[PDB]
Amino acid sequence: KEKDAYFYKESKGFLKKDLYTRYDYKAPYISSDDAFLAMFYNSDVMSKEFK
Amino acid sequence: KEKDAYFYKESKGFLKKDLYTRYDYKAPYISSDDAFLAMFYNSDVMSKEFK
């Protein structure tokens, strides 16, 4: 899947510290556990075929 | 392990947005792959015992 995220560091900007300007992320999201449940625990097609 | 990390959002109060003040993390760090290599591929004590 793809979700929401955030990348942001060192504005190199203004005269007082802790600055950090934000940019927005296109980001690769991966399920590991929900995907497994979908494959074998929610739908039982794969399981039946393999059996 | 425990390492270094970073949590940071919304400094709250400039004329421009994209402010974002940083806070520092105590953070639980987990190896998954390096730990496995240490357990069985770097040192072979566990392996020998099980064999």
Side-chain angles (χ1 to χ4, degrees):
Chain A
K1 316 196 224 308
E2 265 177 351
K3 214 83 220 182
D4 223 348
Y6 302 131
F7 147 74
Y8 46 113
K9 53 182 205 84
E10 295 288 38
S11 317
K12 276 146 178 172
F14 299 66
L15 311 156
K16 300 293 164 260
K17 269 152 190 168
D18 306 323
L19 60 174
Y20 309 146
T21 41
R22 179 139 73 72
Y23 301 74
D24 289 333
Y25 254 48
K26 166 81 139 186
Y29 153 39
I30 178 144
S31 158
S32 36
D33 196 20
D34 305 329
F36 174 81
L37 281 43
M39 294 168 69
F40 307 100
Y41 193 108
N42 294 10
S43 167
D44 59 354
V45 174
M46 289 175 83
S47 169
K48 274 183 193 169
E49 191 179 342
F50 303 153
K51 183 132 190 169
Chain B
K1 318 278 218 298
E2 262 177 349
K3 214 101 212 164
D4 223 348
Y6 305 129
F7 145 73
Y8 64 139
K9 53 183 207 84
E10 191 104 329
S11 317
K12 275 224 174 169
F14 288 63
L15 178 275
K16 288 64 69 181
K17 268 291 162 294
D18 307 323
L19 58 58
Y20 309 141
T21 290
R22 178 139 72 72
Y23 300 72
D24 289 332
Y25 254 70
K26 168 79 138 186
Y29 156 33
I30 178 85
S31 299
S32 210
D33 197 20
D34 163 278
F36 174 81
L37 291 186
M39 294 167 69
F40 307 100
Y41 268 86
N42 294 10
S43 166
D44 59 354
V45 173
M46 288 176 83
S47 169
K48 272 184 193 169
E49 189 178 341
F50 303 153
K51 284 161 189 177

